[PDB]
Design a protein around this ligand. Structure first.
Ligand code: A1D8D
Lengths: 909, 684
């Protein structure tokens, strides 16, 4: 919110040269000057016979801003033999990717070709140039003896690059191994030392590079964008790479180990064709010393109102926890087709609050289609989902869109003011913009009145210039200011005190003693530090004859401002006030309400609380409600306030409405000083009955009940605090578990069936009969373990009623039978017939979870043929039941739940 | 009652406070009675009926025509939506309803544009379509009578990681290395404009030739975009269905995929097909994103069909889930089954309708209640499916406003996706009364002027107050006789304002306006969902967070749309539950899931099939008389005399009917999604 939009720095390059496609800061250690490195991949050069060679330009600062190219390579195509060129530097897109660490610059030409030594061929390996102080070398790890598309021939190395803390370079080539992609990581010292201009395929000893995988991994574009950060706590930066076409184009992000190129983590997107992984950043957003991951999906389509898919883009923010897992949140875009998330730039701490901040671009959004940039601030919980600043493009389009925001680079104080600044690329109009960061000032204000309650007869002081007497008090205005970075030692503040805020043409009641107006404005100087160093003034009341409105409080109001011009510093960078510090502050006073006890009023405040929810469950959609009674049996209380305080985990939904018989209120919800409360809002002997909604769940797991506390605090001097009261609601474990199942219902001989000595197939025996059961937990609580039994007739009168075939289970349960399953290797209850018992044991199931059991059996048709011959019938039936044995809540009470169900099947000839 | 504790101050506030309030402004001034409460009250209390102001919502059809019955060549008489333009009048707090009819006209004109990938693997494919035109004509003759056929081809961008250049003579013939011949790489080329002479298609196919690609994903999205947007070049008819066939063999390129080729300019959606019919910006314009493709397909009313080989179906199917109106099919490796696929796809995208809103103001909100075939109403959703050609469906829509914005007249349209016809709604608001035309500022009718005579009580200026403005800030008389107290003991204006000469006036505020004769109401303390704020899709007055028509709820926190809640079979929540406000909740246990279709304990399907079989076989049962039994029979029914037990997953069932006979039936579904069933002609 502190980026200076009123005076950005402007840099322009040759027309049509894509000046601004790649941006970075150059901070050499050999001088006190810092440059902007701007890539112009289409800039025409003076190299012999080279058309559209590309350039990198050092744009200076604090001078006549002028960009001069760096002469990395002044030669043209080399010759392999007579009339046989080795290289093709035309349209090589040099400068498409630029990075710089310390005094080292790495620029890359992703589209560089070369003539293979094996045969006359033209392949885009891509190359890079590394400038180290005075030396300049060529780095082409993809120019090795792997020649065809199955090797590193089409590597396009240098598409994305990044330095690390340990001076090791990561380079991504999305074309290696049939466009599987590749990460090649090399030490800078080795690259510098192992350079021979006459050697075309150099061998580096300490090269870490991912190797070819199966043909399924093809067309993955591993290395589209790369980032470096630590994710296994070894102290060595690990490698973060985007693979935007992985997992059926769902896009993925690989994190490889930084010392042996082993796979550490994988992130997967949710929507196809979104280029999840188009841009990746690794920085700590919540100051836990654990690097967090930001992944962009600029083409994310999300569902809005009217169920329409809107292309807005998304950013996945993953926070790194010491357990080795990531907590992931999503941040959707704002405008349609703006491609929010195309560029993700860490900034460090933009406002030096303690938590690092980030910037995310929408290169095709804002007014017209000329791109904007959103600045997000980091908090303890992570990223704040509300941008604190919007940077807007200011350049009319041309043959191609300006693409403001297609590139950024932050975390560098180009101004040396103490606040990191930002660069935005506008290669569509061949421009680069430098946004500087202004210092943020935090200001505290203090306003109080000594008596705060005026007995109107206290005419102690005389109004100056006359002998009349008025009732008067004092008002104290105090200011404190401080900030980080380079700020002037003195700031000037304009302060206005309005002695009666709410009334407006109503006649005021309080007046300035040295004046006759309810407004007083003064200019005062504040030191950055020091003390409050504040003053006080005197105000009074007009006599009773002027007005009759005595009930209305007199509201003292304060506004403060500072002259930005005075503190604008030499460069014209004027400061800014903290975003969340309040600029206006108010106090309230009252005239005496004829209490006359001891020149003040003495209230008596009591509260009571109840509810129908005598006992509550462990966890569900809590409908918890409270009925609260508040009584003031004493004298009237000024600014009486009711407070509800709750233990660690709970939430507040709101005040019950549409209830006429129940008094309504405007209760609100606050959380401050690591304490969370509900605060709600009189005359003597006042009775009020209100209702509130709450959501409470158990997360501490040592007590079998939950508590609530109530408090009353008012502005009264003596009866400041009412006695505290507590309320209790018991916790219960209601794990409502049930069983239900079903049999085909009825079964009818088999056509073309003949008798056999022994059956070998399922059709030889007869038709199939299936029984399906399910044990399901529909209660608001979970259960640990349970058992179920299945009672099934098996044989009767030496006749096989049915023949079990096989089991099937779904869920974490293990079953067992009391008799052999499938005694013959095939490829009328239990009260009067031979029985069979199946006992199964099931583990933990939560609310809505269930375990499902499937049984398939064969019907012995010979028994039913004998039945038809003997002229009788079978009343087939079966039963099942369950009983719970354990609940996961050991400290909580345990109850026994047992039930049963019955199934049947009919057979006819 | 309401309209009395609030409003009263002026006619405009009386209109704006609530829809059912009224106002009467007779010059008689019958004081002691309210002028704002209700219409029938103003009828009595000896207030002039001709001075009673009470606008009410009114919607009347402006342009409407009967639905067409057979559109086999009518130039413009073809109609598919019966109301085409209506005028909507809304008092700026209320809502009203109107109906729409949508019909699938028989024998509608069809324009098919066949787009083909032309890689080398497509070569045999190209050989199998050499006679496609005549077969397409003879097959679509029975469906339409205005068939138009166009042809276009694509391989991939002739740019960087696709073909670049080659040091040998492969530039003019890439296939010489394989001792064959082929064309050089081409991005997209328009080949045959939509023509009604079918034989030209065949004549135009024999001269085609494939090109060598580096395998890899193709460039079909550019070809699709250019086919949609190039209106004149391709030759789309406005009053005709538009099927865009897209036949491919391998994977596809996406937007931002051309950055490897050096292309960073986004697709703009315009037409870049020159006189040579070759896509000129192929080497300069990136691939189009699915959002842009969906937008252009909706704008141009093109229905997209993905004819792909099996290898990649599970990809394109998933892609079809991000572009509504797309139909994916199976295509043989020799592409010998493409015609059947196209016939099935055309027959399947004509079977469902779907309404969309265009140019809807942010102020407005709509609620839809659909009525599908068999005269069944399924409120909450706007899309009907399962239709057949010649069928007609209806929808009811009510439109509600939070208030009225600065503009007085606006317009929008309700259009079925894929159709030409639409309904144009012109909405207007009666924000102000009729009496403002006789306003007299500072007239002597108002004491010392100082205000305005607004068809009744004077509106006092600054410093003046009270009825007739007889009191001011120079007098501030405390004698009040208007019961300036909401409750005994309670402050005169609830501490939110002050009583001056009989009436409360509310003092300053920080983050919201204050309304009411007792300063008892505001617009900032409304009840809020999750304690944040009143969600915004509705009114926030007097602590009540009212909601829109499409955002209804106690806290405005769960949409009433029923788009998620239908099951894939074509009915709501699998017929076991109801959509409450966005999630199917089912009333029977042993059921769970998004639509409660996951019920394991539910019985076999033939149990629910038995009543449908009885209905389709014999005339008995109350459900047969009520014809609600037709709802169950979603699958096609055929009468047979032989058991068609041959099938991988064919399901049989038996029924012991009331008679001694036994009913036998079978069913199964196929890959095309059409589920069929057979009933034995005579019961056993
Ligand atoms: C002249 C030209 C340009 C026509 C040419 C020259 C030479 Br010289 C060699 C070729 C081969 C190269 N190739 C070959 O594979 C060799 N036949 C690939 O290029 C290639 C590319 C992918 O981007 C993925 C895959 N593999 C893949 N594809 C799909 C999938 O789902 C998984 N994997 C394979 C060919 O495509 O025919 C072409």
């Amino acid at each position: 919110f502190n980026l200076d939009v009123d005076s950005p720095a402007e840099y322009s390059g040759p027309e049509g040269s894509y000046f601004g496609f790649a941006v970075d800061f150059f901070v050499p250690s050999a001088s006190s000057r810092m440059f902007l490195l701007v890539g112009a991949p289409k800039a025409n050069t003076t190299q012999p016979g080279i058309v559209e060679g590309g350039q990198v330009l050092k744009c200076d600062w604090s001078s006549t801003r002028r960009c001069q190219p760096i002469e990395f390579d002044a030669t043209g195509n080399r010759d392999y033999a007579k009339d046989d060129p080795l290289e093709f530097k035309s349209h090589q897109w040099f400068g498409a990717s630029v990075r710089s660490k310390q005094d080292k610059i790495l620029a890359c030409a992703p589209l560089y070709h070369w003539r293979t030594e094996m045969k006359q061929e033209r392949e885009p390996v891509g190359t890079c140039f590394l400038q180290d102080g005075t030396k300049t070398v060529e780095y082409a790890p993809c120019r090795s003896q792997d020649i065809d598309a199955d090797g590193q021939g089409f590597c396009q190395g240098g598409f994305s690059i990044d330095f690390t803390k340990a001076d090791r370079v990561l380079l991504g080539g999305p074309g290696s191994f049939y466009w599987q992609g590749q990460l090649i990581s090399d030490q800078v010292a080795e690259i510098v030392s192992k350079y021979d201009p006459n050697v075309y395929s150099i061998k580096y000893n300490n090269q870490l590079a991912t190797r070819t995988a199966q043909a399924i991994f093809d067309d993955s574009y591993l290395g589209y964008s790369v980032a470096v950060g630590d994710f296994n706590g070894d102290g060595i930066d690990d490698f973060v790479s985007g693979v935007p076409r992985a997992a059926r184009t769902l896009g993925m992000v690989y994190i490889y180990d930084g010392k042996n190129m082993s796979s550490l983590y994988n992130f997967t997107g949710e929507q196809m064709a979104a280029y999840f992984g188009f841009s990746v950043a690794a920085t700590d957003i919540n100051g836990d010393d654990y690097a967090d991951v930001f992944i962009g999906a600029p083409l994310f389509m999300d569902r809005g109102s009217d169920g329409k898919l809107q292309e807005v883009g998304q950013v996945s923010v993953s926070l790194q926890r010491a357990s080795g897992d990531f907590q992931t949140t999503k941040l959707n875009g704002f405008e349609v087709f703006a491609r929010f998330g195309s560029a993700i730039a860490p900034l460090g701490d933009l406002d030096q609050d303690g938590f690092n901040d980030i910037a995310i671009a929408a290169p095709y959004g804002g007014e017209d289609k000329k791109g904007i940039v959103y600045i997000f601030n980091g908090r303890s919980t992570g990223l704040n989902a509300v941008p604190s600043q919007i940077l807007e493009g200011q350049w009319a389009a041309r043959s191609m869109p300006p693409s403001f925001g297609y590139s950024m680079k932050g975390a560098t104080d180009i101004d040396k003011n103490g606040y990191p600044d930002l660069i935005v690329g506008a290669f569509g109009v061949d421009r680069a913009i430098l946004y500087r960061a202004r210092p943020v000032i935090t200001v505290n204000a203090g306003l109080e009145v000594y008596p705060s309650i005026l007995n109107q007869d206290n005419k102690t002081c005389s109004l100056p210039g006359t002998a009349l007497k008025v009732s008067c008090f004092n008002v104290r205005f105090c200011l404190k200011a401080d900030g980080k970075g380079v700020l002037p030692r003195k700031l000037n503040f304009q302060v206005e005190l309005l002695l009666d805020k709410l009334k407006q043409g109503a006649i005021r009641r309080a007046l300035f003693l040295y004046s006759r107006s309810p407004s007083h404005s003064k200019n005062m100087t504040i030191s950055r530090g020091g003390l409050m160093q504040c003053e006080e003034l005197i105000a009074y009341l007009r006599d009773e004859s002027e007005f009759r409105d005595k009930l209305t409080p007199i509201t003292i109001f304060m506004e403060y401002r500072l002259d930005y011009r005075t503190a604008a510093d030499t460069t014209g960078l004027q400061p800014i006030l903290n975003q969340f510090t309040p600029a206006n502050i108010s106090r309230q006073a009252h005239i005496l309400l004829d209490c006359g006890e001891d020149n003040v009023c003495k209230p008596k405040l009591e509260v009571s609380v109840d509810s129908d929810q005598k006992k509550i469950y462990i966890g569900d959609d809590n409908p918890l409600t409270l009925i609260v009674k508040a009584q003031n049996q004493g004298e009237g209380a000024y600014e009486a306030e009711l407070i509800v305080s709750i233990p660690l985990q709970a939430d507040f939904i709101g005040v019950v409405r549409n209830n006429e018989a129940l008094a309504r209120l405007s209760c609100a919800f606050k959380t401050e000083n690591q304490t969370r409360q509900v605060v709600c809002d009189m005359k003597a002997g006042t009775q009020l009955l209100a209702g509130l909604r709450f959501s409470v769940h158990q997360q501490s797991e040592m007590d079998t009940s939950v508590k609530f506390d109530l408090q009353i605090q008012s502005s009264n001097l003596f009866d400041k605090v009412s006695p505290v009261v507590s309320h209790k609601v018991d916790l219960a474990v209601l794990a409502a578990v049930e069983i239900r199942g079903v049999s085909p219902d009825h079964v009818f001989p088999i056509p073309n069936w003949e008798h056999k000595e022994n059956p070998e197939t399922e059709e030889d025996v007869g038709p199939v009969v299936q029984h399906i059961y399910e044990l399901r937990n529909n209660g608001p609580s979970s259960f640990s373990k349970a058992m179920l039994h299945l009672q099934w007739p098996y044989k009767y009168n030496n006749n096989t009623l049915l023949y079990i075939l096989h089991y099937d289970i779904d869920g974490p349960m293990n079953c067992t039978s009391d008799m052999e399953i499938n005694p013959l290797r095939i490829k009328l209850g239990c009260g009067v017939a031979q029985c069979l018992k199946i006992v199964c044991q099931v583990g933990r199931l939560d609310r809505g979870k269930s375990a499902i059991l499937y049984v398939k059996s064969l019907l012995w048709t010979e028994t039913f043929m004998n039945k038809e011959n003997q002229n009788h019938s079978y009343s087939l039936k079966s039963s099942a039941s369950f009983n719970v044995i354990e609940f996961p809540y050991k400290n909580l009470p345990i109850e026994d739940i047992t039930n049963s169900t019955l199934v049947t099947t009919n057979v006819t000839w | 009652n309401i309209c009395t504790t609030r409003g009263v101050s002026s006619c405009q506030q009386c209109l704006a406070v609530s829809p059912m309030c009224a106002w009467c402004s007779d010059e008689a001034l019958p004081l002691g009675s309210p002028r704002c409460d209700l219409k029938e009250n103003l009828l009595k209390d000896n207030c002039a009926p001709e001075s009673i102001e009470f606008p009410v919502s009114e919607a009347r059809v402006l342009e409407d025509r009967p639905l067409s019955d057979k559109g086999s060549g009518d130039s413009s008489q073809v109609t598919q939506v019966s109301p085409q333009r209506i005028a909507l009048r809304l008092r700026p707090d209320d809502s009203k309803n109107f109906s729409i009819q949508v019909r699938q006209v028989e024998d509608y004109p069809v324009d098919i544009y066949y787009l083909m990938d032309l890689s080398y693997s497509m070569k045999d494919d190209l050989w199998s379509i050499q006679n496609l035109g005549t077969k397409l004509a003879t097959q679509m003759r029975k469906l339409t009578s205005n068939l138009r056929i166009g042809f276009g081809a694509f391989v991939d961008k002739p740019v960087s990681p696709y073909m670049y250049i080659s040091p040998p003579e492969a530039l003019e013939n890439p296939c010489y290395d394989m001792k064959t011949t082929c064309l050089p790489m081409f991005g997209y080329k328009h080949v045959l404009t939509l023509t009604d002479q079918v034989t030209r298609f065949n004549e135009e196919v024999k001269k085609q030739s494939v090109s060598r690609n580096r395998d890899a994903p193709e460039g079909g999205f550019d070809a699709i975009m250019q086919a949609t947007v190039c209106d004149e070049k391709i030759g789309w008819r406005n009053d005709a269905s538009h099927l865009l066939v897209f036949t491919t063999d391998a994977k596809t390129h996406i937007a931002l995929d051309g950055r490897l080729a050096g292309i960073v300019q986004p697709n703009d959606g315009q037409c870049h097909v020159g006189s040579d019919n070759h896509y000129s910006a192929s080497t300069t314009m990136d691939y189009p994103s699915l959002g842009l493709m969906t937008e252009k397909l909706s704008q141009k009313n093109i229905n997209l069909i993905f004819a792909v080989t099996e290898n990649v179906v599970n990809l394109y199917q998933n892609y079809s889930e991000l572009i509504p109106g797309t139909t994916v099919g199976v295509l043989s490796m020799d592409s010998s089954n493409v015609l059947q696929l196209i016939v099935d796809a055309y027959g399947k995208i004509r079977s469902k309708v779907e309404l969309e809103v265009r140019d809807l103001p942010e102020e407005l909100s709509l609620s839809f209640n659909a009525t599908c075939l068999n005269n069944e109403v399924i409120p909450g959703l706007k899309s009907c499916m399962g239709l057949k050609i010649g069928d007609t469906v209806s929808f009811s829509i009510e439109a509600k406003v939070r208030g009225c914005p600065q503009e007085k007249e606006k317009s929008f349209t309700i259009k079925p996706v894929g159709f030409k016809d639409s309904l144009i709604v012109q909405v207007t608001f009666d924000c102000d009364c009729a009496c403002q035309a006789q306003a007299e500022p500072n007239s002597h009718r108002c004491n010392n002027g100082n205000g305005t005579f607004e068809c009744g009580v004077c509106r006092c200026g600054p410093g003046w107050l009270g009825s007739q403005c007889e009191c001011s800030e120079e007098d501030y008389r405390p004698s009040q006789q208007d019961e300036c107290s909401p409750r005994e003991g309670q402050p005169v204006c609830s501490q939110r304002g002050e009583c001056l000469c009989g009436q409360c006036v509310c003092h300053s505020s920080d983050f919201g306006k204050i309304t009411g004769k007792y300063c008892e109401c505001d617009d900032f303390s409304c009840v809020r969902y999750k304690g944040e704020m009143c969600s915004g899709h509705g009114q926030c007055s007097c602590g009540d967070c009212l909601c829109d028509s499409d955002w209804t709820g106690y806290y405005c926190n769960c949409t009433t749309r029923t788009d998620t809640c239908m099951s894939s079979n074509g009915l709501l929540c699998s017929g076991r539950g109801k959509c409450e406000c966005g999630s199917c909740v089912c009333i029977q246990p042993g059921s769970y899931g998004d639509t409660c279709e996951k019920c394991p304990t539910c019985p076999d399907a033939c149990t629910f099939k038995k009543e449908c079989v009885e209905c389709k076989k014999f005339d008995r049962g109350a459900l047969h008389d009520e014809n609600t039994c037709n709802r169950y029979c979603r699958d096609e029914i055929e009468s047979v005399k032989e058991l068609k037990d041959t099938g991988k997953d064919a399901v049989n069932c038996t029924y012991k009917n009331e008679d001694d006979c036994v009913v036998r039936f079978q069913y199964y579904e196929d890959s095309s999604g059409k589920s069929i069933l057979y009933v034995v002609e005579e019961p056993e």
